[PDB]
Design a protein around this ligand. Structure first.
Ligand code: HEM
Length: 153
């Protein structure tokens, strides 16, 4: 469970994220695809974009990024009482897309990287540790929802 103070740090940095959701989306995905290439294969519509620049100019990918970070941002604002908008995420991702929890760790890594690269003065030790706790709570709860629908993490 997160402290009031940690939740505040998380939401403090997210507010910076929200000043350019689109750019953060692209960067996080680009990081993810380059760092763990097996991830790009889950996306049939992106798995041809060869270059970073091709990645950055794809408006399909751009929009996807915003859709992903908007869902995550609604969950973080719940400060962990996120049952209701966690469930549709787990049902899509467990039954349809079939995203292993390890791929969720991978994008968790990409998020923290990008966050630290774009906002170091607002993303120091305390803030990274808080965000990390936030994303680890999210992954635990989704792994439990995954199991409730079958197929284990
Ligand atoms: C922070 C963790 C994640 C967030 C919040 C997120 C969020 C979303 C949302 C909101 C959608 C659209 C509705 C639906 O879920 O189908 C989506 C679709 C999708 N997500 Fe995730 N996602 C996460 C990470 C992942 C990862 C790591 C991958 C693995 C490549 C993945 C693959 C997909 C795929 C394949 C779809 C369907 C895309 C399509 O064919 O249009 N997502 N995601």
């Amino acid at each position: 469970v997160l402290s009031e103070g940690e939740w505040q740090l998380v939401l403090h940095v997210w507010a910076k994220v929200e000043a350019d959701v689109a750019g953060h989306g692209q960067d996080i995905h680009i990081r993810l695809f380059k760092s763990h290439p097996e991830t790009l294969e889950k996306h049939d519509r992106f798995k041809h974009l060869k270059t970073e620049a091709e990645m950055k100019a794809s408006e399909d990918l751009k929009k996807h990024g915003v859709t992903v970070l908007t869902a995550l941002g609604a969950i973080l604002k719940k400060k962990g009482h996120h049952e209701a908008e966690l469930k549709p995420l787990a049902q899509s991702h467990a039954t349809k897309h079939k995203i292993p929890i390890k791929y969720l760790e991978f994008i968790s890594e990409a998020i923290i990287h990008v966050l630290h690269s774009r906002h170091p003065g607002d993303f120091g030790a305390d803030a990274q540790g808080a965000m990390n706790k936030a994303l680890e709570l999210f992954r635990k709860d989704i792994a439990a929802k995954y199991k409730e629908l079958g197929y284990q993490g």
